[PDB]
Enzyme design. Structure first.
Site, PDB file in Angstrom:
ATOM      1  N   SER A   1      -0.706  15.732 -11.923  1.00  0.00           N
ATOM      2  CA  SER A   1      -0.956  15.368 -13.301  1.00  0.00           C
ATOM      3  C   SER A   1      -1.199  16.630 -14.122  1.00  0.00           C
ATOM      4  O   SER A   1      -1.720  17.621 -13.618  1.00  0.00           O
ATOM      5  CB  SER A   1      -2.159  14.419 -13.365  1.00  0.00           C
ATOM      6  OG  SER A   1      -2.572  14.188 -14.697  1.00  0.00           O
TER       7      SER A   1
ATOM      8  N   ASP B   1       0.827  -1.202   0.000  1.00  0.00           N
ATOM      9  CA  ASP B   1       0.000   0.000   0.000  1.00  0.00           C
ATOM     10  C   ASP B   1       0.865   1.258   0.000  1.00  0.00           C
ATOM     11  O   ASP B   1       1.353   1.666   1.048  1.00  0.00           O
ATOM     12  CB  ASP B   1      -0.885  -0.008   1.249  1.00  0.00           C
ATOM     13  CG  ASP B   1      -1.796   1.194   1.326  1.00  0.00           C
ATOM     14  OD1 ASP B   1      -1.925   1.901   0.306  1.00  0.00           O
ATOM     15  OD2 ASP B   1      -2.403   1.415   2.397  1.00  0.00           O
TER      16      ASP B   1
END
Length: 330
Positions: free
Chosen positions: A199, A35
């Site tokens: 992004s 994770d």
């Protein structure tokens, strides 16, 4: 040193991925959920409340000659999906794909929430976010990666998750055979303890690319892609019959649909998520309403590039002094 381990979807939807991990002496192999959105290595154990164990393999520290109680240390964690676990702490030898760390904090669960009990395939979590998020008190502990880093050939790990198929986590090297083209690296902020990056935009299907900054985290422990409501609405508007359902808890679409792809930007590069990756199947067994793999982050407080996004790429988690993230197509 290096390590290389195969990671395998737990079910037909790729809800999560499990990777075998050797703990203790002699080795006890547990299948852990790696994770990159958390920083605790915790396991089902001989200490876990018996009624909260249902099929998991447990770690038994009393059977390990290298286990030592970390006296006084406790831990307690809550995740974004509302699940939780807590317990005490041992140190022991932990190996992943042939890479060994001695003295790793292995957090033994005394209690786990229902979602963990119900997932018989997941024996615990191995956190790979920054150690500043680790929950051990009163002495915070380091992640497996942080402990391994100095010994690694290069201070990196890579995630190469499969779509309905096994993939690979590598430590200490970049497998240049595992991706196509070049790797595009992008800046990371560690301020919130995550692999947080920005992004450069998105496209829906064959549509034009929209240049827009989207701050989010690369999180292998989250199944879906959670993005701003504007972006998610633009995506689902291209699917006839798709709608946001408060009763179901997100966007659903007709199971008869063919989903468009979704592209996200990494600098000037582009990663394309095929439409099929965005299908999470019937909302309930036999339903003709299907659950979407792109969902709104509104009210999470952070955008999350979860498995839906990450499995479309070869992803480099660069833990050099200035950390960065790399993405390549594959």
């Amino acid at each position: 040193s290096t390590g290389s381990a195969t990671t395998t979807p737990i079910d037909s939807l790729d809800d999560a991925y499990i990777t075998p991990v050797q703990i203790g002496t002699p080795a006890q192999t547990l299948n852990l959920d790696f994770d990159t959105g958390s920083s605790d290595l915790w396991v089902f154990s001989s200490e876990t409340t018996a009624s909260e164990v249902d099929g998991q393999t447990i770690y038994t520290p009393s059977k390990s000659t290298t286990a030592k109680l970390l006296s006084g240390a406790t831990w307690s964690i809550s995740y974004g999906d509302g699940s939780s676990s807590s317990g005490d702490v041992y140190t022991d030898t932990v190996s992943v794909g042939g890479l060994t760390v001695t003295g790793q904090a292995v957090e033994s669960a005394k209690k786990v929430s229902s979602s963990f009990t119900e997932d018989s395939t997941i024996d615990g979590l191995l956190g790979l976010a920054f150690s500043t998020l680790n929950t051990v008190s009163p002495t915070q502990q380091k992640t497996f990666f942080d402990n391994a880093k100095a010994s690694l050939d290069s201070p990196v790990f890579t995630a190469d998750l499969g779509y309905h198929a096994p993939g690979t986590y590598n430590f200490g090297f970049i497998d240049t055979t595992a991706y196509t083209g070049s790797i595009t690296y992008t800046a990371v902020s560690t301020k919130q303890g995550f692999w947080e990056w920005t992004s450069t935009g998105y496209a829906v299907g064959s549509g034009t690319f929209k240049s827009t900054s989207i701050d989010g985290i690369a999180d292998t422990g989250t199944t879906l892609l959670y993005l701003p409501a504007t972006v998610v609405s633009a995506y689902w508007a291209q699917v006839s019959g798709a709608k946001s359902s408060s009763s179901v808890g997100g966007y659903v679409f007709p199971c008869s649909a063919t989903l468009p792809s979704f592209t996200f930007g990494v600098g000037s590069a582009r990663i394309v998520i095929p439409g099929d990756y965005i299908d999470f199947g019937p909302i309930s067994t036999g339903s003709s309403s299907c659950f979407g793999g792109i969902q709104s982050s509104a009210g999470i407080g952070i955008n999350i590039f979860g498995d839906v996004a990450l499995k479309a790429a070869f992803v480099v988690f660069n833990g050099a002094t200035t950390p960065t993230l790399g993405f390549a197509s594959k």
